């Protein structure tokens, strides 16, 4: 099995540096180039540079000359990318991908799972959870406002209500995240059978339940 295992997510202050890693296995490390690619918020892809551990040769996109530094450790089958002087512009997912050096008919045949980098001044802030209360089918919801960082877990009746649910992706208000979730239940269910939205924030180690009261 060919596999490229990348390092876990990273939260860093503006101006600091971070070192992403791409650990390879299942093949001869020295026979394949390792390309690095950038993607912000599931957008388009952007090539940063590559490192070929066969010769030690390196190449950068002119854009990332003074941003990225590629290095490798042959004895651990790992290629590193160091990003310097981080801003909010550098907040993105970063993929590594292998490419057979000595074959013209080579393509980028195996990819890493990706590493999420977040660059922000913000302190860890727990969310304010507010219930949203108002036909044969009724819609409830709850607002999760002013938390940092990502992510949060939103469930309904501790997972019981799976279908009829729409948890939306967060946005940035100032330097904090705001998220919303909706659930649809039959009009005879509610309020007789109480509906509760469960919000959990790992970072601030907070868990909160709000009953939707009419």
């Amino acid at each position: 099995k060919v596999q490229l295992q990348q390092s876990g997510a990273e939260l860093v202050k503006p101006g600091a540096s971070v070192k992403l890693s791409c650990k390879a296995s299942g093949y001869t490390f020295t026979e394949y180039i390792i390309h690095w690619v950038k993607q912000k918020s599931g957008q388009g892809l952007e090539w940063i540079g590559w490192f070929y551990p066969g010769s030690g040769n390196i190449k950068y996109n002119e854009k990332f000359k003074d941003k990225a530094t590629l290095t490798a450790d042959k004895s651990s089958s790992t290629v590193y990318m160091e990003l310097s002087r981080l801003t909010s512009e550098d907040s993105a997912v970063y993929f590594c991908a292998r490419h057979e050096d000595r074959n013209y008919y080579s393509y980028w045949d195996y990819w890493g799972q990706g590493t999420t980098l977040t660059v922000s001044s913000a302190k860890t802030t727990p969310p304010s959870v507010y219930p949203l209360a108002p036909n044969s089918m009724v819609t409830l919801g709850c607002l999760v406002k002013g938390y940092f960082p990502e992510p949060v877990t939103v469930t309904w009746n501790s997972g019981s209500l799976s279908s009829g649910v729409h948890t939306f992706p967060a946005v940035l208000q100032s330097d904090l995240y705001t998220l919303s979730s909706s659930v649809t239940v039959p009009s005879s269910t509610w309020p007789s059978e109480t509906v509760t939205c469960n919000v959990a924030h790992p970072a601030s180690s907070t868990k909160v339940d709000k009953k939707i009261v009419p």
Binding site: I33, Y52, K59, E100, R102, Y104
Partner: peptide
Amino acid sequence: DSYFSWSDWWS
């Protein structure tokens, strides 16, 4: 030997 190298060709 293929006498071909992407790293060399791109360099």
